[PDB]
Each structure stands twice: as C-alpha cells, then as structure tokens.
C-alpha cells in the first residue's frame, strides 16, 4: 500500500499490531478471565506496546 513494509512481520510476531485479547479467539479470552483466579494464561501472550 504505502504502509511500512515490516508491518506484516511485526503484526504476526507481536512487536506491533493488536493486543492479545483482540488477536486471540473470543472463546479463549473468556476462558482466561474465568480461570484467572487460579490458572493465569496472561503471561503466555504478548501485548504490543508502541
């Protein structure tokens, strides 16, 4: 397009792009929240910070 050319690589590998809670499937997101009090899954994923 005219976007950065390293953008597809970054998006994939979570250096840029969207939070893992918009990247993850919606069912997994609600699973994680439910079992947040005894079985964290939050540290298994990355949030891009830019």
């Amino acid at each position: 397009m005219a976007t950065p050319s390293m953008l597809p690589q970054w998006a994939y590998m979570h250096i840029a792009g969207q939070d893992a809670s918009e990247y993850l499937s919606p069912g997994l997101v609600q699973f994680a929240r439910a079992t947040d009090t005894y079985f964290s899954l939050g540290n298994k994923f990355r949030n891009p910070t830019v």
Binding site: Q18, D19, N47, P48, T49, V50
Partner: peptide, 24 residues
C-alpha cells in the same frame, strides 16, 4: 489537612497499539 489537589478525574486512556491517546 495541609494539602494540594490536581487534575485527576481524567486518566491515561491509551491502547495496546499506541502510548498516546490522540488529539484532533
């Protein structure tokens, strides 16, 4: 109470795709 108070009823609104919440 010898004290101060500041602009605080508004917060850092930023997304996990940008550390800056934009301005028009």
């Amino acid at each position: 109470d010898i004290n101060f108070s500041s602009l605080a009823p508004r917060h850092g609104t930023r997304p996990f795709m940008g550390t800056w919440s934009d301005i028009g």
